[PDB]
Design an enzyme around this catalytic site. Sequence first.
Site, PDB file in Angstrom:
ATOM      1  CG  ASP D 203      30.348  32.008  30.357  1.00 56.49           C
ATOM      2  OD1 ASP D 203      29.188  32.364  30.058  1.00 56.49           O
ATOM      3  OD2 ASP D 203      30.717  30.816  30.367  1.00 56.49           O
ATOM      4  CB  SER D 228      33.869  39.741  29.917  1.00 66.77           C
ATOM      5  OG  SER D 228      33.205  39.014  28.899  1.00 66.77           O
ATOM      6  NE  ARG D 229      36.734  33.364  34.265  1.00 67.57           N
ATOM      7  CZ  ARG D 229      35.987  32.939  35.277  1.00 67.57           C
ATOM      8  NH1 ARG D 229      34.880  32.250  35.042  1.00 67.57           N
ATOM      9  NH2 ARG D 229      36.348  33.202  36.525  1.00 67.57           N
ATOM     10  CB  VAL D 230      32.988  35.886  26.125  1.00 64.76           C
ATOM     11  CG1 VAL D 230      32.788  36.216  24.658  1.00 64.76           C
ATOM     12  CG2 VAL D 230      32.240  34.625  26.511  1.00 64.76           C
TER      13      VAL D 230
END
Lengths: 136, 117, 284, 366, 73, 52, 52
Positions: D203, D228-230
């Site tokens: 992710d 960071s795709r979170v």
Amino acid sequence: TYHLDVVSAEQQMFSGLVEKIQVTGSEGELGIYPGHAPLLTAIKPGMIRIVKQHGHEEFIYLSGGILEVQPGNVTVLADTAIRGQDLDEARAMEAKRKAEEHISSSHGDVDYAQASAELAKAIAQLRVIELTKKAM
Amino acid sequence: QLDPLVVGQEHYDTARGVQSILQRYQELKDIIAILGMDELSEEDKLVVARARKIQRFLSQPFFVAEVFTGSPGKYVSLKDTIRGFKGIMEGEYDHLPEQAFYMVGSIEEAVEKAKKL
Amino acid sequence: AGAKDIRSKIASVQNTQKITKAMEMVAASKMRKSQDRMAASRPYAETMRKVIGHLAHGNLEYKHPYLEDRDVKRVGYLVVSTDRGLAGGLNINLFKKLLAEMKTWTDKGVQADLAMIGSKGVSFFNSVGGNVVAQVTGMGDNPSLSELIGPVKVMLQAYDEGRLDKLYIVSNKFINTMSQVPTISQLLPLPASDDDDLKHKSWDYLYEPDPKALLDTLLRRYVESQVYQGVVENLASEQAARMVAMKAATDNGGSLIKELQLVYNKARQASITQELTEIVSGAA
Amino acid sequence: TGYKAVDSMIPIGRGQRELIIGDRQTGKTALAIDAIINQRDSGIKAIYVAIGQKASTISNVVRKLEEHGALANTIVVVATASESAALQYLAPYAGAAMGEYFRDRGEDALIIYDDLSKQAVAYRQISLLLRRPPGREAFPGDVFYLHSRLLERAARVNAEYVEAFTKGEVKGKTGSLTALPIIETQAGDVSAFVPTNVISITDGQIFLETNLFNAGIRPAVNPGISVSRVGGAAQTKIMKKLSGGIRTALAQYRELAAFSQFASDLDDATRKQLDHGQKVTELLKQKQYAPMSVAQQSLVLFAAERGYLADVELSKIGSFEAALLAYVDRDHAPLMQEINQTGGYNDEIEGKLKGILDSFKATQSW
Amino acid sequence: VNPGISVSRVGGAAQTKIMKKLSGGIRTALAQYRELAAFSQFASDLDDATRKQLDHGQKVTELLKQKQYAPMS
Amino acid sequence: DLDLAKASATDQLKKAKAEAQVIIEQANKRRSQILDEAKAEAEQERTKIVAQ
Amino acid sequence: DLDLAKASATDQLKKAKAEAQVIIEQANKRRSQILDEAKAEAEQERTKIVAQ
Ligand SMILES: Nc1ncnc2c1ncn2[C@@H]1O[C@H](COP(=O)(O)OP(=O)(O)OP(=O)(O)O)[C@@H](O)[C@H]1O
Ligand SMILES: [Mg+2]
């Protein structure tokens, strides 16, 4: 008051409104008030005094020039460097010597030098044509 | 192992300074090539000479290369190496020729070769 | 081919494209600063030309050598050129126009003499073999008049001493931010004015000390200003021509990236299959 | 993670999978073990799985874990470079099971897989020795299903799952396992096979750039290419507020400073962006074993973002940063406590931080 | 023959001392020529000091050319 | 004298801040020395107790 | 305007004298903090190494 310009061949030096000026014309000191008759003269190297209206006094150094005054107007075509029969002949002598030889100087554009050398190394021996089948 | 904590700050600083000088010289090399050296600023005309002397001084004659060159080899202690480079970078030898540093051992051989040269 | 050799060349062309973009930006700023300095120079020449026109073509027209068309036997050119490359065709366009006009003159059997601003013109004309007689080079971003004084002085001295009978400046005119044109214009004998100062009938100057020496100085200074203006206009033409040329070079690089990436894709596919086929066919 | 660069630019959440990716010798192992050491005095239990590492590296890692007191928190799983490929291939799954024990009980764990690329090489060896058909680079066909079924175990599980698994013995807790796989690229070609698989699995990635690392920019995290795709959902509020600009500001500073080398005598407007970027890039590096708490990072970032550097922008910004931390630790510890306990951010806290930097700049030295 | 990409690990040990003496300046002249080769596509942008190395390395490269079946003593 | 007082205040501030910095770097050097002494003592203490 | 100048000059010199005394007193405070912390770490390290 009247309008005054101090102009060099390169850039302007003064453009305010003036009540009077004092200059050294070639044939002597000379003081221009408002309405002064049209006149044309050289001026000698040295200072000119301006009094801007409201009486503010300042001194401008001039390497020479020509003064020309008009109905309600005056201009000082100031030289940018000292002029003379000998200085100008020395400069022409060097300009002649540099051409009778084949001597040349280096431009100061260090930015162009950097980019030029980076591009010259980067573009060297790519072999990109023949690798790319572009004919042209 | 090249960090201040194990080699000491003196060695680390000498090494980083040598690398910085050589990088700056590699930058100036193309300005020298296009413009010519007489256009460089007077502190850059000094980085050039000091880098060129560093670039000479870290060559060395080996005992086993003698059969290739005939000249005798030299063994250089780490103390003499740091002393030499730290001196060169600080301008203590700006008066010697460049060839006084080529294929020498300790800096004493550099000063003695220049005295002979 | 080879996948790595091609990727290395792709990186090297991307680096070239980036360099050319930076050069385009730098030139596009230098062009604005130069074309403003170009406008800072007009008042001197304009007000001096009005004075000369009053003294020379008005009432009580004084006589001077620079004013009148003596017969022509040899000709002088002041040639402005760059000290720098990557400007596109700008200098070669100008020098070929000069060599054409100079050859037309030499058909009539007249001789021609050259004075050079900038190193490119010196190199080209010496390779061609032109008769350069004075030069100034290394003006850079900073063209002074106090350096123009020299070659202009040589050509003015050669004129009044009676050797040169006509004097030209050869320069690129800046017209638009993407349009510049090589031109030859006559400096001496003084061009005819369009305007008539008959409306200056109503006044005359108090000439201190004396009009004739003062008209001599005025004409010498005016020729100088007109040459300086031709140098600064050519310098702004240089910055604009470099801007356009670096733009085109950046687009050529961007096309070459496409063509190299296609060749790289084919190479890496062929490598994958030639390896996996060797492995599978080797296992009896 | 205790690193200003990661915690501001690239926030990591409990249950996230963040790929530490970069060329050889760029601080991958250092960044991982410093994350472990930071986990000391948090509820997170740490696991370090070393795959194919030389034994001297493991000896050093364990000495540094016990020295900084982090060892009592963490499990170390070892399969050294000389051990049979079967042990190297099957290690990360053992580490993942030891971590999943904590995950399934409603606790938090963090696991680091050192060189998954070496696990893929050990699985390639064990596969070829069994005559199994090869694939794109001789790696077996299912090498993706090797890394996938490992990394998908790193998860956050909801309270109903942990309640049903533990047969009602735990009610309110949510369990999580956080994975930081390490991948080694060759000359930074992200588009290689195993790297672009693991990048298609995780992710996010912390891309570590070698030419930043050699220039002394340590840790050498590369903005822009790292994400960071979170994202900010994991980040604490004060860090989310302060850090919003830093990543794009740094990327545009880097491109502008690339342009700058060819353009001397440049606009005085960009002259300030290109200074402020050069100071923020100088500020975000830090020493080998020095983890920094959220309050320390927050106030340093507040100092950098609200212009308090611009006079000290000269130099000695490292000494400035150390002196600022020591001053704040002497006087305003009740605020460092509030920030560390709540992470909250208020106009009142904004005013407090203004007052701290005003008092520091006027009265102290560096 | 592509010098500098081509190696002999025996070196001067297999040369008459006159050849060994004379060859080092050829090696350094071609190494400098190879380093300064890139600028050659923009020769008249260069300084005269580097220009003298560039056109010297061209003259050495031109001197090595030799017709087949004419061995030299 | 108003502008000379301004230059005197700014010189007094910068002089005092550099004078404080030499005090701090003296403390840092002292710390480095006393920690090196403590380490060398712990090195010898280990060598004795492990031989015993 | 001269009386105002004398007042302003004396006030700014009083401020700079206070600030210099504050800066150097806090520098001595920092130095004392460093030297205490170094004493504590000297024993913390020695005890760590002997237990090791
Ligand atoms: N923040 C830092 N400050 C100073 N030195 C550092 C920092 N991070 C790493 N180093 C040093 O850089 C070196 C390489 O670090 P590290 O071993 O983490 O790299 P690596 O990429 O894990 O190595 P490899 O890829 O070979 O396994 C080590 O000597 C380490 O001490
Ligand atoms: Mg490592």
